[PDB]
């Protein structure tokens, strides 16, 4: 040691770490980045559950983000900030199982509550190193301990031959779990309270958080949860065992391959090779045609999430859940004909019925008719501006809003304290067109407090709003309640109940309560539509 900053040397179960004093707007923070939490899932270890990181010697340098798990890189709009912001930002490699910790500087006196971030990316992409997940502001301004882990995505993370020894399924979720275990054992070394661990995540990350709520071994590893624009139930977060098996076999064939023999072959294929084909498994025209997601294997998920949210005891659970104004808009540009970032995307009725088939690929002819009918404004059934917005809502409501309204519903009714929001503020800095509104993913930069960095060109009120949001989230991590125990002159955020179905709007104005989360429409998707398949 000798000369090193003493505030930046920590020991964990695996050995010694040297961190980095990072500069934040209102003062310094500590970052320990790229701490390994598992033996690299490489070689024979591919597709297999993660093994804990065998202890190292000397002082590990933990001052940079590590490799990002091997994934498909988005190339729809080269140069485009609005898509690149999600692209991997460190080397792609299968050796990717590391996690990051941000803590106050100096590391705090008494043990602070911990927030853990599980990123999204539809289970096919993502990294804890992306800028919009920088934990420094929450660390600095809210005295929070923040942790984020890398977990395997795509085939490496989720390709499953259910029932086999060699590719059991859900290993991405199992990487996430090992990181939570690591948190329990080690977070205290950084002044973290292993008895106050809140999970938060967004899209597939929010679905992840939901599945930890539903998976017993993972239940003992956290206390509160926050699900932003995602759910474990719903059309895209899981697969039946058989389907997962079909998809893995099909991919195996595509790359040129008794389960052992099959996976053995797969394992000898180069990483990129697998990534190059993961999209071909469903020629099937479908936005959410991502083939490798969590499998209902009767192990990690003892049963479908839908089943488990209708029969679980959530007496002891505080949950924060919400959606953004325009969940679907973002998705339209990725293969719904007529939609683009570069024009107003006004579509024709023909393009609407066509987009409904693609957006809802599980839908029969009669169901597509049902959807089209429910979303048509019969005053102006030909108006392109409306149809455009309709197509957005269909995709948005089917994939996010209704699963979330359902999740809030069942959980509240089944003993949970649920708090629900809808995020309504578009970034002054947003680089997507006006027609896309407040799109899926664009709350994250606010929760994380990015507008506090003066160099980012956010308006003043955005900087105030960010602070306000960070208060809600961390208050929730702290107490199970987003409200302020002291200051109650500014309006209260009531729990969501079956009785009142109350949620609040998040935008530049003070809090506003509303009743009913797309109540009528979600009744369509959650109650009616299923039965139109018992036919």
Ligand X SMILES: *[C@@H]1O[C@H](CO)[C@@H](O)[C@H](O)[C@H]1NC(C)=O
- Positions annotated as catalytic residues are 203, 327, 440
Q: Which residues pair with 35 in a beta bridge?
A: 99
Give yes or no for residue 519 binding its own copies (CB under 8 A): yes
- Rule CB under 8 A: choose which of 184, 376, 467, 507 binds its own copies: 376
Query: Would you state the structure tokens that stand for residue 510, as one six-digit string?
Result: 């003070």
Q: Which 30-89 positions form the footprint of its own copies (CB under 8 A)?
A: none
Residues lying near ligand X in the complex (CB under 6 A) = 338, 340, 343
Partner from its own copies, ligand X, none contacting 343, C-beta within 5 to 8 A by type: ligand X
Neighbours of 210 (CB within 10 A): 30
Give yes or no for residue 353 binding its own copies (CB under 8 A): no
In Å, how far are 32, 36, 38, 68 from 54, measured between CA atoms?
18, 9, 8, 20
* CA dihedral for 190, 191, 195, 201, sign (positive or negative): negative
Partner from ligand X, its own copies, none contacting 378, C-beta within 5 to 8 A by type: its own copies
- Rule CB under 8 A: choose which of 366, 464, 508, 513 binds its own copies: 366
Residue closer to its own copies (CB basis): 216 or 535: 535
Distance (Å, whole) CA 101 – CA 381: 52
Give yes or no for residue 524 binding its own copies (CB under 8 A): yes
Identify the three-state secondary structure at position 323. strand
Read off the DSSP letter of residue 401: I
Compute CA 67 distance to the chain's CA centroid, rounded to the nearest angstrom. Answer: 19
Q: Counting every residue, how long is the chain?
A: 535
Residue closer to ligand X (CB basis): 75 or 460: 75
Residue closer to ligand X (CB basis): 380 or 515: 380
Least distance to its own copies, CB of residue 356, Å = 14
Least distance to its own copies, CB of residue 391, Å = 18
Candidates 15-23, 214-222, 229-237, 368-376 — which segment interacts with its own copies by CB under 8 A?
Answer: 368-376
Distance (Å, whole) CA 475 – CA 482: 5
Partner from its own copies, ligand X, none contacting 509, C-beta within 5 to 8 A by type: none
Give yes or no for residue 394 binding its own copies (CB under 8 A): no
Residue closer to ligand X (CB basis): 138 or 332: 332
Partner from ligand X, its own copies, none contacting 533, C-beta within 5 to 8 A by type: none
Q: Where are the beta strands (DSSP E) in 161-315?
A: 192-202, 224-228, 239-240, 295-296
Partner from ligand X, its own copies, none contacting 370, C-beta within 5 to 8 A by type: its own copies
Identify the three-state secondary structure at position 248. helix
Least distance to its own copies, CB of residue 502, Å = 11
DSSP calls for 18-79: E-EEEEETTEEEEEEEEEE-B----GGGTTSPPPBPPP--SEEE-BS---EE--PPP-SSTT
Pair 402, 229: CB distance under 8 Å: no
Partner from its own copies, ligand X, none contacting 340, C-beta within 5 to 8 A by type: ligand X
Region of 72 please: left (phi>0), alpha (psi -120 to 50) or beta. Answer: beta
Residue closer to ligand X (CB basis): 268 or 343: 343
Least distance to ligand X, CB of residue 386, Å = 15
Residue closer to its own copies (CB basis): 420 or 470: 420
Pair 125, 58: CB distance under 8 Å: no
Residue closer to its own copies (CB basis): 378 or 486: 378
Contacts 24+ apart (CB under 8 A), 350-356: 351/387, 351/391, 352/387, 352/390, 352/391, 355/391, 355/394, 356/391, 356/394
Partner from ligand X, its own copies, none contacting 109, C-beta within 5 to 8 A by type: none
- Rule CB under 8 A: choose which of 110, 216, 342, 378 binds its own copies: 378
Least distance to ligand X, CB of residue 359, Å = 17
Give yes or no for residue 370 binding its own copies (CB under 8 A): yes
Pair 224, 480: CB distance under 8 Å: yes
Least distance to ligand X, CB of residue 340, Å = 4
Give yes or no for residue 516 binding its own copies (CB under 8 A): yes
Interface residues toward its own copies, by CB under 8 A: 366, 369-370, 373, 376, 378-379, 501, 515-516, 519-520, 522-524, 527-528, 531-532, 535
């Amino acid at each position: 040691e000798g000369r090193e900053d003493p505030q930046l040397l920590v020991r964990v179960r695996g050995g010694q770490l040297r961190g980095i004093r990072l500069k934040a707007p209102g003062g310094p923070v500590s970052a320990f980045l790229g701490i390994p939490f598992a033996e690299p899932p490489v070689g024979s270890r591919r597709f297999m559950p993660p093994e804990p990181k065998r202890p190292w010697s000397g002082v590990l340098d933990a001052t940079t983000f590590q490799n990002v798990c091997y994934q498909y890189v988005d190339t729809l709009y080269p140069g485009f900030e609005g898509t690149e912001m999600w692209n991997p930002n460190r080397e792609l490699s299968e050796d990717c199982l590391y996690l990051n910790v941000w803590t106050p500087y100096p590391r705090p006196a008494s043990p602070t509550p911990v927030l853990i971030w599980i990123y999204g990316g539809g289970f096919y992409s993502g990294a804890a190193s992306l800028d919009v997940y920088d934990g420094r502001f929450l660390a600095q301004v809210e005295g929070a301990v923040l942790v984020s882990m890398n977990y395997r995505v795509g085939t490496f993370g989720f390709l499953a031959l259910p029932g086999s020894r060699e590719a059991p399924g859900n290993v991405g979720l199992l990487d996430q779990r090992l990181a939570l275990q690591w948190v329990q054992e080690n977070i205290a070394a950084f002044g973290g309270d292993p008895m106050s661990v809140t999970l938060f995540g967004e899209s597939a990350g929010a679905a992840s958080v939901g599945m930890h709520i539903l998976s017993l071994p993972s239940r003992s590893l956290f206390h509160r949860a926050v699900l932003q624009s995602g759910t474990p139930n719903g059309p895209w977060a899981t697969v039946s065992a058989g389907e997962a098996r079909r998809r893995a076999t099909l991919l195996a064939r595509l790359v040129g391959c008794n389960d052992t023999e099959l996976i053995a072959c797969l394992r000898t294929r180069p990483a990129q090779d697998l990534v190059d084909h993961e999209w071909h498994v469903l020629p099937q025209e479908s936005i959410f045609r991502f083939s490798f997601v969590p499998v209902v294997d009767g192990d990690f998920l003892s049963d479908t999430p839908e089943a488990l949210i209708n029969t679980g005891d959530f007496q002891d659970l505080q949950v924060l859940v919400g959606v953004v104004k325009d969940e679907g808009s973002y998705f339209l540009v990725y293969g719904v004909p007529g939609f683009s970032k570069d024009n107003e995307s006004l579509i024709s009725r023909a393009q609407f019925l066509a987009g409904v088939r693609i957006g809802v690929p599980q839908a029969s002819d009669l169901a597509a008719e049902a959807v089209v009918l429910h979303y048509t404004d019969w005053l102006h059934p030909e108006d392109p501006t409306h149809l455009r917005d309709a197509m957005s809502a269909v995709v948005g409501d089917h994939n996010v809003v209704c699963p979330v309204a359902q999740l809030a519903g069942r959980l509240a009714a089944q003993g949970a304290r649920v708090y629900a929001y809808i995020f309504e503020h578009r970034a002054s800095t947003l680089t997507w067109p006006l027609w896309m509104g407040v799109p899926h993913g664009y709350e994250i930069e606010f929760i994380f407090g990015l507008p506090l960095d003066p160099s980012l060109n956010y308006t003043t009120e955005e900087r105030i709003f960010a602070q306000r949001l960070m208060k809600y989230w961390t208050n929730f991590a702290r107490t199970g309640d987003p409200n302020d125990p002291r200051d109650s002159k500014s309006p209260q955020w009531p729990p969501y109940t079956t009785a009142a179905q109350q949620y609040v709007s998040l935008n530049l104005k003070p809090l506003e309560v509303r009743r009913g989360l797309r109540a009528q429409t979600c009744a369509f998707w959650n109650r009616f539509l299923p039965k139109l398949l018992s036919a």
